[PDB]
Design a protein around this ligand. Sequence first.
Ligand SMILES: C[C@@H](c1cccc2c(-c3ccc(CS(C)(=O)=O)c(F)c3)c(C(=O)O)[nH]c12)N1C[C@H](CCCN)OC1=O
Ligand SMILES: [Zn+2]
Ligand SMILES: [Zn+2]
Length: 232
Amino acid sequence: SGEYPTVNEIPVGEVRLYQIADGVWSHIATQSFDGAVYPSNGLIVRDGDELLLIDTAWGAKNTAALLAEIEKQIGLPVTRAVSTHFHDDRVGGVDVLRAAGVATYASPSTRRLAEAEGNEIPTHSLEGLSSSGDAVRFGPVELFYPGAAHSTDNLVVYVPSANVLYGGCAVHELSSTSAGNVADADLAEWPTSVERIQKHYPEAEVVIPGHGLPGGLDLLQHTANVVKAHKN
Ligand SMILES: C[C@@H](c1cccc2c(-c3ccc(CS(C)(=O)=O)c(F)c3)c(C(=O)O)[nH]c12)N1C[C@H](CCCN)OC1=O
Ligand SMILES: [Zn+2]
Ligand SMILES: [Zn+2]
């Protein structure tokens, strides 16, 4: 009923949307992984009379439920999707999207890592993002490659009309006590990558992590802090 929906509040298989700003929503779903349940976020950005999707809802059935929830709550077609790194919480559901008419995109680095890992593979490659600090426009957002952090391929997304910074899994929520799933992370480079984000998007008003609650710019410094302590 209005607060940001939380892990214990969403059954696995249901999706909820949360209005972030005019024409910007997050999507929230839950999934089981190695015997524990986790929430995860994505983004929806209005693109005239179409929608741009950032990240799947972590699985095929969750992503089908996402499309149904978008049609119920918004009623505009999802035409393009971008996955911000290669893990299942970002690409799991790409096959569902591709069968629902959605053109799926990711960097070549993400596509290679997804293919090598056995994860679902976005169709189209996003060039122009291979060097840290690179930025490209994609509909109503800017895509930014900050450098290696949670993964070597992680992208962040900025919505300039609303000053919304979607950090994806390179950014953690304020309540976090460690750096999440660090399997593919570069803990040494992560603070430098976060510093690049801070320098590039100083006017961000909302910061959305890959998992958990949105907040303000403090999420970036908090992320650096929990990562530095995890490495140590
Ligand atoms: C699918 C993904 C994956 C699965 C399960 C959990 C997560 C978490 C995660 C964990 C804890 C917290 C709370 S907290 C900040 O307080 O610790 C959190 F917010 C997020 C993340 C993430 O941190 O983004 N991602 C996960 N996977 C799988 C892949 C490894 C595959 C190797 N066989 O790597 C990866 O990330
Ligand atoms: Zn990940
Ligand atoms: Zn993640």
